[PDB]
Motif scaffolding. Structure first.
Motif, PDB file in Angstrom:
ATOM      1  N   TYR A 140       0.830  -1.203   0.000  1.00 18.56           N
ATOM      2  CA  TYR A 140       0.000   0.000   0.000  1.00 18.56           C
ATOM      3  C   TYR A 140       0.867   1.256   0.000  1.00 18.56           C
ATOM      4  N   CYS A 141       0.564   2.209  -0.893  1.00 17.02           N
ATOM      5  CA  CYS A 141       1.319   3.454  -0.946  1.00 17.02           C
ATOM      6  C   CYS A 141       0.413   4.567  -1.458  1.00 17.02           C
ATOM      7  N   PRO A 142       0.776   5.830  -1.194  1.00 17.32           N
ATOM      8  CA  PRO A 142      -0.020   6.948  -1.747  1.00 17.32           C
ATOM      9  C   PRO A 142      -0.010   6.945  -3.269  1.00 17.32           C
ATOM     10  N   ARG A 143      -1.149   7.307  -3.861  1.00 18.68           N
ATOM     11  CA  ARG A 143      -1.288   7.263  -5.305  1.00 18.68           C
ATOM     12  C   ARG A 143      -0.502   8.363  -6.000  1.00 18.68           C
ATOM     13  N   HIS A 144      -0.108   9.419  -5.295  1.00 20.17           N
ATOM     14  CA  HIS A 144       0.701  10.482  -5.877  1.00 20.17           C
ATOM     15  C   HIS A 144       2.155  10.061  -6.046  1.00 20.17           C
ATOM     16  N   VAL A 145       2.485   8.790  -5.819  1.00 23.50           N
ATOM     17  CA  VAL A 145       3.795   8.311  -6.261  1.00 23.50           C
ATOM     18  C   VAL A 145       3.932   8.415  -7.777  1.00 23.50           C
ATOM     19  N   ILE A 146       2.805   8.369  -8.498  1.00 20.32           N
ATOM     20  CA  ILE A 146       2.840   8.419  -9.959  1.00 20.32           C
ATOM     21  C   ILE A 146       2.988   9.828 -10.499  1.00 20.32           C
ATOM     22  N   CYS A 147       2.971  10.820  -9.626  1.00 17.09           N
ATOM     23  CA  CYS A 147       2.963  12.213 -10.022  1.00 17.09           C
ATOM     24  C   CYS A 147       4.370  12.800  -9.978  1.00 17.09           C
ATOM     25  N   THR A 148       4.631  13.710 -10.903  1.00 15.70           N
ATOM     26  CA  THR A 148       5.772  14.602 -10.802  1.00 15.70           C
ATOM     27  C   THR A 148       5.370  15.824  -9.979  1.00 15.70           C
ATOM     28  N   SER A 149       6.367  16.629  -9.606  1.00 15.50           N
ATOM     29  CA  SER A 149       6.070  17.844  -8.852  1.00 15.50           C
ATOM     30  C   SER A 149       5.127  18.761  -9.619  1.00 15.50           C
ATOM     31  N   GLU A 150       5.205  18.746 -10.952  1.00 17.47           N
ATOM     32  CA  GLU A 150       4.301  19.546 -11.772  1.00 17.47           C
ATOM     33  C   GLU A 150       2.892  18.964 -11.818  1.00 17.47           C
ATOM     34  N   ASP A 151       2.765  17.641 -11.748  1.00 19.59           N
ATOM     35  CA  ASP A 151       1.445  17.026 -11.771  1.00 19.59           C
ATOM     36  C   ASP A 151       0.626  17.400 -10.547  1.00 19.59           C
ATOM     37  N   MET A 152       1.289  17.639  -9.405  1.00 15.48           N
ATOM     38  CA  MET A 152       0.573  17.820  -8.143  1.00 15.48           C
ATOM     39  C   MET A 152      -0.345  19.036  -8.163  1.00 15.48           C
ATOM     40  N   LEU A 153      -0.161  19.962  -9.112  1.00 17.79           N
ATOM     41  CA  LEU A 153      -0.990  21.166  -9.148  1.00 17.79           C
ATOM     42  C   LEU A 153      -2.424  20.840  -9.540  1.00 17.79           C
ATOM     43  N   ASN A 154      -2.603  19.999 -10.560  1.00 15.94           N
ATOM     44  CA  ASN A 154      -3.934  19.598 -11.021  1.00 15.94           C
ATOM     45  C   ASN A 154      -3.838  18.206 -11.631  1.00 15.94           C
ATOM     46  N   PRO A 155      -3.664  17.189 -10.801  1.00 19.12           N
ATOM     47  CA  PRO A 155      -3.496  15.835 -11.343  1.00 19.12           C
ATOM     48  C   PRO A 155      -4.828  15.182 -11.641  1.00 19.12           C
ATOM     49  N   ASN A 156      -4.867  14.436 -12.750  1.00 21.50           N
ATOM     50  CA  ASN A 156      -5.969  13.533 -13.077  1.00 21.50           C
ATOM     51  C   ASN A 156      -5.434  12.121 -12.897  1.00 21.50           C
ATOM     52  N   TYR A 157      -5.651  11.555 -11.709  1.00 22.71           N
ATOM     53  CA  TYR A 157      -4.949  10.334 -11.355  1.00 22.71           C
ATOM     54  C   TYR A 157      -5.327   9.183 -12.270  1.00 22.71           C
ATOM     55  N   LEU A 194       9.178  15.112   6.485  1.00 25.04           N
ATOM     56  CA  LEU A 194       9.946  15.795   5.455  1.00 25.04           C
ATOM     57  C   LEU A 194       9.668  15.125   4.124  1.00 25.04           C
ATOM     58  N   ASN A 195      10.153  15.742   3.037  1.00 27.22           N
ATOM     59  CA  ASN A 195       9.968  15.198   1.690  1.00 27.22           C
ATOM     60  C   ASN A 195      10.498  13.775   1.651  1.00 27.22           C
ATOM     61  N   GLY A 196       9.675  12.862   1.135  1.00 30.24           N
ATOM     62  CA  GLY A 196      10.016  11.462   1.080  1.00 30.24           C
ATOM     63  C   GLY A 196       9.396  10.630   2.190  1.00 30.24           C
ATOM     64  N   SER A 197       8.762  11.276   3.163  1.00 25.50           N
ATOM     65  CA  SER A 197       8.135  10.560   4.269  1.00 25.50           C
ATOM     66  C   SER A 197       6.742  10.034   3.930  1.00 25.50           C
ATOM     67  N   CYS A 198       6.159  10.473   2.801  1.00 24.16           N
ATOM     68  CA  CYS A 198       4.846   9.978   2.406  1.00 24.16           C
ATOM     69  C   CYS A 198       4.857   8.455   2.410  1.00 24.16           C
ATOM     70  N   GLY A 199       3.727   7.866   2.760  1.00 18.21           N
ATOM     71  CA  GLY A 199       3.643   6.439   2.919  1.00 18.21           C
ATOM     72  C   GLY A 199       3.930   5.943   4.317  1.00 18.21           C
ATOM     73  N   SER A 200       4.545   6.783   5.155  1.00 26.16           N
ATOM     74  CA  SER A 200       4.653   6.478   6.573  1.00 26.16           C
ATOM     75  C   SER A 200       3.260   6.250   7.134  1.00 26.16           C
ATOM     76  N   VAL A 201       3.146   5.344   8.110  1.00 26.80           N
ATOM     77  CA  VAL A 201       1.831   4.991   8.628  1.00 26.80           C
ATOM     78  C   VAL A 201       1.729   5.228  10.136  1.00 26.80           C
ATOM     79  N   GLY A 202       0.482   5.403  10.582  1.00 27.57           N
ATOM     80  CA  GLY A 202       0.146   5.495  11.992  1.00 27.57           C
ATOM     81  C   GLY A 202      -0.622   4.255  12.396  1.00 27.57           C
ATOM     82  N   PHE A 203      -0.440   3.844  13.645  1.00 32.95           N
ATOM     83  CA  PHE A 203      -0.974   2.555  14.049  1.00 32.95           C
ATOM     84  C   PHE A 203      -1.199   2.531  15.555  1.00 32.95           C
TER      85      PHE A 203
END
Ligand SMILES: [Cl-]
Ligand SMILES: [Cl-]
Lengths: 306, 306
Positions: free
Chosen positions: A37-54, A141-150
């Motif tokens: 399991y990971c965030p779906r914005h792994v498929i995005c570039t920094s430019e995609d994050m403004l208005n992504p169509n996943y 920090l940048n790169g921490s996405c996907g970290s989980v809470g439990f």
């Protein structure tokens, strides 16, 4: 004796953390059984994050575009799908370190432990609470996405959070493990503002009980109150309203210490109206609201986990 | 963004925790290679703790009197010895989960993570500092003895603390892994009082740097100072004296933020003389001194561990 902001042991989650790379984006994933399991914005570039169509960005992705690394060993991706704001990457090998686990969506005011990770590697562990405005005050920090809470109950890990975004104000937003954001936030670089960060009243009272159990008692007074009268003070200071449900949850701590819940509400009232006059409670100069009543009971009795 | 009191991932230590029972006393031990380390007062009854003669009490103990349980499996004790205030129990099986590790004796002001355990089972993890008076402010209940404190550098666990005692004032005292107490404390139920708990000045400055890195900057002023002049204020408020060694350690944070160490000392001075006027710094209403300069750099850059 002593009361501390304490996280759950992280070993069971450490064994689930992997690195996920898509194109030039790298973040963390959670490997349970044969799914990552990971965030779906792994498929995005920094430019995609403004208005992504996943959905449209995902069409260009095949199994082999998702590089999954478990420490040093590469995992083979045999399938992928999008569920709300998470990707599920099916791999050909079940994680041999998979613990017993559940996916739970927690309510505002509930606490959990976060295992901060970068490149699939654990960095540290700390305790958080889901704020009433559905943010968390974390350390990401940048790169921490996907970290989980439990949370952990004996032998079972209840996964409740996956980190996705950082608001311009420095606070954090994420999803449950089904990919649904807590609160109204979305995985886009957009004008997203958090609402009022109210204080979790029931947690402050539990923490006052914890203080009495450990010798900090200067704040106990001669007064009592009623729910309606206390809530008039709570509103003025942006405290969550106290309900009869909250009183019932505090019953066991009220029983152990012999201080009726409403008597402790009257002590909290005076602390809110008069401040702490430079004193401290359990080593803090403000009123802590990230301990639940269940957290207090656990730490004050020595509960362990398999 | 965000700065949090964060412990090291505990999994590597969790795999070393076992239960040690002697007679009717049960506490925790640390299983590394084929040796189990535990406090020597496992051999004592509650009555012995008043005036124990450990050498004499140990004569009545044989290998089979020390019951060592690794979760659910019993370990065979083939040898035992006393080293200062710890027992080393030689077992016939090397711990297969032994990490790379070292034994280190830390100095006052250094931080470490504690894995609180009961009956050999992890309960939670939190961050501590060795106070200038050689106590720690932990969270320890009866049965937590043998819990250890540690640091991690990449793949290597540096064990620095084992918990032994709780002073009447609620603070805690323990040994390094060679069995030598930090400070003047002894493993006897005796009139033992802690000295002045001074504030770790260099850690407060590092934490002020961390705050600036994360947007909390209201405390920056237009003044500077000198070491001697700042130390006149430090003494008045029971702050550790700041030395040129401390200034050098802060250099990297001074370089990153562009705020000279002595300028930040002048901001700390005004905070000590005028208080915080009801404001907060990184979510705290007092000045935090349990983050080292190395802790700040680590959390502010995303350092990970194998
Ligand atoms: Cl908590
Ligand atoms: Cl720290």
């Amino acid at each position: 004796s002593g009361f501390r902001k304490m996280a759950f042991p992280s070993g069971k989650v450490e064994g689930c953390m992997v690195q996920v790379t898509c194109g030039t984006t790298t973040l963390n994933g959670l490997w349970l059984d044969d799914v990552v399991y990971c965030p779906r914005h792994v498929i995005c570039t920094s430019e995609d994050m403004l208005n992504p169509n996943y959905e449209d960005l995902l069409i260009r992705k095949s199994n082999h575009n998702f590089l999954v690394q478990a420490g040093l060993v590469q995992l083979r991706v045999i399938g992928h799908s999008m569920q709300n704001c998470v990707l599920k990457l099916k791999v050909d090998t079940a994680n041999p370190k998979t613990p017993k686990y559940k996916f739970v969506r927690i309510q505002p005011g509930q606490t959990f432990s976060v295992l901060a990770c970068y490149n699939g590697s654990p960095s540290g562990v700390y305790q958080c609470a889901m704020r009433p405005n559905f943010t968390i005050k974390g350390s990401f920090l940048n790169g921490s996405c996907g970290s989980v809470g439990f949370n952990i109950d004996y032998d079972c890990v209840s996964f409740c959070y996956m980190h996705h975004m950082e608001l311009p104000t420095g606070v954090h937003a994420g999803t449950d493990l089904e990919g649904n954001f807590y609160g109204p936030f979305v995985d886009r670089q957009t004008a997203q503002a958090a609402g009022t960060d109210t204080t979790i009243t029931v947690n402050v009272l539990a923490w006052l009980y914890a203080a009495v159990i450990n010798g900090d008692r200067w704040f106990l007074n001669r007064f009592t109150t009623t729910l309606n009268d206390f809530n008039l003070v709570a509103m003025k200071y942006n405290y969550e309203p106290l309900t009869q449900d909250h009183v019932d949850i505090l019953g066991p701590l009220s029983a152990q210490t012999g201080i009726a819940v409403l008597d402790m509400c009257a002590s909290l009232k005076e602390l809110l109206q008069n401040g702490m006059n430079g004193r401290t409670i359990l080593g803090s100069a403000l009123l802590e609201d990230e301990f639940t009543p269940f957290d207090v009971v656990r730490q004050c009795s020595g509960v362990t986990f398999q």
